[PDB]
Design an enzyme around this catalytic site. Structure first.
Site, PDB file in Angstrom:
ATOM      1  N   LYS A  63       0.862  -1.175   0.000  1.00 43.60           N
ATOM      2  CA  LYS A  63       0.000   0.000   0.000  1.00 43.60           C
ATOM      3  C   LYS A  63       0.901   1.227   0.000  1.00 43.60           C
ATOM      4  O   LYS A  63       1.556   1.543   1.003  1.00 43.60           O
ATOM      5  CB  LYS A  63      -0.900  -0.031   1.233  1.00 43.60           C
ATOM      6  CG  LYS A  63      -1.815   1.125   1.414  1.00 43.60           C
ATOM      7  CD  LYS A  63      -2.548   0.977   2.766  1.00 43.60           C
ATOM      8  CE  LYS A  63      -3.617   1.991   2.969  1.00 43.60           C
ATOM      9  NZ  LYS A  63      -4.310   1.650   4.213  1.00 43.60           N
ATOM     10  N   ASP A 151     -14.167   2.642   9.499  1.00 43.69           N
ATOM     11  CA  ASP A 151     -14.434   2.443   8.077  1.00 43.69           C
ATOM     12  C   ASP A 151     -14.759   0.980   7.803  1.00 43.69           C
ATOM     13  O   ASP A 151     -14.314   0.391   6.815  1.00 43.69           O
ATOM     14  CB  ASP A 151     -13.288   2.957   7.217  1.00 43.69           C
ATOM     15  CG  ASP A 151     -13.652   3.166   5.761  1.00 43.69           C
ATOM     16  OD1 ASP A 151     -14.848   3.281   5.440  1.00 43.69           O
ATOM     17  OD2 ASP A 151     -12.674   3.216   4.953  1.00 43.69           O
TER      18      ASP A 151
END
Ligand SMILES: OCCCn1nnc2c(Br)c(Br)c(Br)c(Br)c21
Ligand SMILES: [Cl-]
Ligand SMILES: [Cl-]
Ligand code: NA
Length: 327
Positions: A63, A151
């Site tokens: 990432k 989230d």
């Protein structure tokens, strides 16, 4: 005036270095050990690649973090370091930088994910119980570590349906819970935002994640994904109120002294609380038991304090078949 029912003081009771992420100094390894193979996705804050560590042939996910305040990078890194070893939390293998540009990246274990849109139409009753139990382990763990994910949604729950492996990913919005702290309500995906966010109530806690979890459970047992499909943040609350009821919303607001944005006055209407059985039909009936409905009713509640904790949810009879199998 609201506080979490569980884990309220856990950060206060730890060393300041645990939660003072702005003071954290990561050790940045060398990204040159990784070969990018394939792009897996992109978001506002990152791009994600499947990769191979060329020194040991391990398949991983990298990432690459896009330009943001270094503060948000430190937050995510410190949260992941605090969560090390946590059950069903994505494993952070290393924190690395391009040795020239110094762009930071996070290296995670690989999961051979099946996109939820395919998966959520072929799950059995036991599969739903199993995967929800596994996800609850991750949430109980992070809540116990003083962290709200903020989230929770299918796109952040990687499921290898062949190996039955689940991981909660993308800790970039996660925060440390401190009692009485006011938090930004601009977190979570629209469809998974708790009513507290939608009414601009900033003194929220781990229970926000339990709303999102409930939304996922509803989508699985009823096969309507996302379950609450608002067109914008205002309409999102209307969709919730058409199920949970408008008088029930107003009682929640009154209890917590919450001010309601007057744009809602034109759109909420008047709606009676609906029975959860109204969502049953021939296509989902085999997934919906009394236990599933009782659990769901205790998650999808306006009153964030009254929602089950992750642990209370894990203890619910709906998961007894899973516990028995895992013993
Ligand atoms: O819904 C997001 C799909 C793309 N995506 N984004 N971050 C990911 C991480 Br981290 C891992 Br591990 C895996 Br596997 C995947 Br796939 C990821
Ligand atoms: Cl915040
Ligand atoms: Cl509806
Ligand atoms: Na609002």
């Amino acid at each position: 005036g609201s506080r979490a029912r569980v884990y309220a003081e856990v950060n206060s009771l730890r060393s300041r270095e645990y939660w003072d992420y702005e003071a954290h100094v990561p050790s940045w390894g060398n990204q040159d050990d990784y070969q990018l193979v394939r792009k897996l996705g992109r978001g506002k804050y990152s791009e994600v690649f499947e990769a191979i560590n060329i020194t040991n042939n391990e398949r991983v996910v990298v990432k690459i973090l896009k330009p943001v305040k270094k503060k948000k990078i430190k937050r995510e890194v410190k949260i992941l370091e605090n969560l090390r070893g946590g059950t069903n939390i994505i494993k952070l293998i290393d924190t690395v930088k391009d040795p020239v540009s110094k762009t930071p990246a996070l290296v995670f274990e690989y999961i051979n994910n099946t996109d939820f849109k395919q998966l959520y139409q072929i799950l059995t009753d036991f599969d739903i119980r199993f995967y929800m139990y596994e996800l609850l382990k991750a949430l109980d763990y992070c809540h116990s570590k003083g962290i709200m994910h903020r989230d929770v949604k299918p796109h952040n729950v990687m499921i290898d349906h062949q190996q039955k492996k689940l991981r909660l990913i993308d800790w970039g919005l996660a925060e440390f819970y401190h009692p009485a702290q006011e938090y930004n309500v601009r977190v979570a995906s629209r469809y998974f935002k708790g009513p507290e966010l939608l009414v601009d109530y900033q003194m929220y806690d781990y229970s926000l994640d339990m709303w999102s979890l409930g939304c996922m459970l509803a989508s699985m047992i009823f096969r309507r994904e996302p379950f609450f499909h608002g067109q914008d943040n205002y309409d999102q609350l209307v969709r919730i109120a058409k199920v949970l009821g408008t008088e029930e919303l107003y009682g929640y607001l009154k209890k917590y002294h919450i001010d309601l944005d007057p744009h809602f006055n034109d759109i909420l209407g008047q709606h009676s609380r609906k029975r959860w059985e109204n969502f049953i039909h021939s296509e989902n009936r085999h997934l919906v038991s009394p236990e599933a409905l009782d659990l769901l009713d205790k998650l999808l509640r306006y009153d964030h304090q009254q929602r089950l904790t992750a642990k209370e949810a894990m203890e619910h009879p709906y998961f007894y078949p899973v516990v028995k199998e895992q013993s």
